[PDB]
Amino acid sequence: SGFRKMAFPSGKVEGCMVQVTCGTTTLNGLWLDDVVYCPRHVICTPNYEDLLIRKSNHNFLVQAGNVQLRVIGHSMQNCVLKLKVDTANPKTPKYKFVRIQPGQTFSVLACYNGSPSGVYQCAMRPNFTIKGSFLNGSCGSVGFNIDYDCVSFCYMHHVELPTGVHAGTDLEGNFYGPFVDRQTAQAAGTDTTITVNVLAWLYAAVINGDRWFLNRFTTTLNDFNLVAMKYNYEPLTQDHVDILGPLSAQTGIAVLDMCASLKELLQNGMNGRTILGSALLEDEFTPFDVVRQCSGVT
Amino acid sequence: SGFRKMAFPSGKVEGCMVQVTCGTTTLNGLWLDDVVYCPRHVICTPNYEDLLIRKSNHNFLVQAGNVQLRVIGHSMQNCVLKLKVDTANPKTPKYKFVRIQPGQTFSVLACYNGSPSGVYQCAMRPNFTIKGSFLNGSCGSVGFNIDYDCVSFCYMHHVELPTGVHAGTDLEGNFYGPFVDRQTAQAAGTDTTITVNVLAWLYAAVINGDRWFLNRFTTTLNDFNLVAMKYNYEPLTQDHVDILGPLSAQTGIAVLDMCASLKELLQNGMNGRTILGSALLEDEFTPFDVVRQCSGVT
C-alpha cells in the first residue's frame, strides 16, 4: 500500500551521462554506442547551420567521468547535435528513442556537468511543457521510461520558459510544442487538466482505501464531458474508458461511476478532506503508473 | 526553477540488490562486500534465535541477477540477517550505515525479487513510520542518501502497519520506533507535522516566485511555538532557526518573519491559493533538500 510519485531506477541512464563543453558553455550529453547527443545550443556564444560549419571536432570537449572522449565527427539533427566519438560506451543499455504524447509520464535524471544529481517523475502537459526542476547547467538532461531491460528515451531538456516551466525535444531533436532553442518571447499556452489521469489516481485512491468521494451515481460520457469542458479538463474518450478497464475491474467501480465522483469533486470541492494525502486532484499519474505501483512490476 | 520530490540517483544501490529465498519466502537483500543483509523474518514460516539455530547455509538461496551466490556463513544482528557469501560484490560503492532522525528524508529503492522497480523520496515521520509505497515482496528494500560518492544507508523495509504506513530498521537491524518484526496489534502512534521542513518548503516557494503568503510581520519564537502546539506542529528550536540561515539569507526573509507567514496560513488557510502546486503545507522537504535543489549539487 501507499502511493508515491515514483521514478524508474536511474542506473542505466547514469552510465550514459557525459559532460559536453564548447567554448565557455558546458552542458550534459547522452553517450550511447559511439555517439554523444546534446542540445545544439552548446555551440552558441542565430543561424545554427552557419554556427556549426564554423566548428571543428576539437572544439567539443567530451568528458565521461575521468575519461576524455575524442570527437571524430559531428552533425546536427534538428535541435540536437550528434558527436561521433572514437569509443562506444560499454555501459550502453538496450534503448529506443520514442516520442511521447501529452498526458504521458516519464522519469527525469537531472544532471549538472555530466554528473547525475537527482531523479523525479513528471508528465508532458497538454500544452507541451513539463513542470520540471532544473537549474543552470541542466540542459541535456534526459527523460525516459524503462520496460524490462529497455530504456525508452523520450525527452532532452533545452529551455526554461518565463513561467518557470520547461521545454525540450525528443531524442531526434524535434521540440515538443511550439518552442524554439532561441531567444524569443515564447511562452507556454493555456494548459488543461489530464482527465484520464485524474480518474486513474482516483482508482489508486480506492485501491489504497480512500473511498469517501464515491457515490451510487453513474453519469454518461457526454454528460461528464460537458462538465469537463466547464472546468478546463480534457475530454474523456471511449479509448480512455477502455484503458481504465483493468482498474475498474480490480475495484469493481465502473469508469462512468467514477466519473460521477469526479463531477461531484469538481462542483463541490473536497470539504476539507484529502485523497492520497493531496487536497487537489492529481493528474500526473497515468493508468499504467497506477497499475505498475498497485501491482509491483520491476 | 521548479521544485519536485527528487530522489538520489539509484544506480549505486541497484548494483547491490539481490534476491534472498528461504523456504517459500522470497524477499530482497543488500549485497555489500561479501555480506548480504536482509530482514530476519525471511526465516519464518516466534523465537528467532531458535529459528536460526535450526537453519543451515544451504537453506538460503541468494541470487544476484543470473548468478547464484554461495552462502558460507550466517548470523543474526538484531532484526537483520547477515549472510556471508563467497564473493565480494564488485559493484560495492563507498558506503556507510547511518541512522536518521525523525524529520529527515531519504530515497527508497523499491524492489521485488531482487529487481529494482522504482525510486522515490520520503521522510521519517515524528512517529517513526514512513509513508512509503510497498507491495508484497518489497521487504528488504532499502533507503539511502548519497553524498559525493558515498551511499549512506539508513533504512531497510520490514513491515506494513494497519493504517498502510511502513516500519523498518536501520542497517544494524534496530527498528525505528516501537515496532517489531512479529504479529502483534502494533499501530502507529499519533503523528505531528515537521515544522522546520514546512518553513524550508516556504523558502523554496519564495525562491521559485510564490510570495503571496508573505507579510510584513515578525513573531517571536515563543509566540510561534504556542501556535505550533495548537496545530499539532513540532516545536521550533533555535537550532532550527540556525539551520534555516542559508535560506533566510538567500531570500532576505528572516526565519521569524517566515514564521509569521506560517502562523497566518495555519489560522486562515490558503483561501483557494496554492504554494508550489500544493493546497496543503508540505513537510517532507528538509532545509538541505531545498538548498540541494535550489542550488544544484550533484
Author numbering:
A (entry chain A), B (entry chain A): 1 to 45, 52 to 304
Paper text:
Two strains carried double nucleotide mutations T10200A (3CLpro: M49K) and A10547G (3CLpro: M165V) in the viral genomes, whereas the other two strains carried double mutations T10200A (3CLpro: M49K) and T10955C (3CLpro: S301P). Conformational changes in the three regions are also observed in the crystal structure of the M49K/M165V double mutant, but not in the crystal structure of the M165V mutant or that of the S301P mutant. These structures demonstrate that the M49K mutation disturbs the local structure around the substrate-binding pocket of 3CLpro, but the M165V mutation does not induce conformational changes. Specifically, the kcat/Km ratios of the double mutants, M49K/M165V and M49K/S301P, were only about one fifth and one seventh of that of the WT 3CLpro, respectively. The double mutants M49K/M165V and M49K/S301P exhibited stronger resistance to ensitrelvir as compared to these single mutants: the IC50 values are 10.2 and 7.8 times that against the WT 3CLpro, respectively.
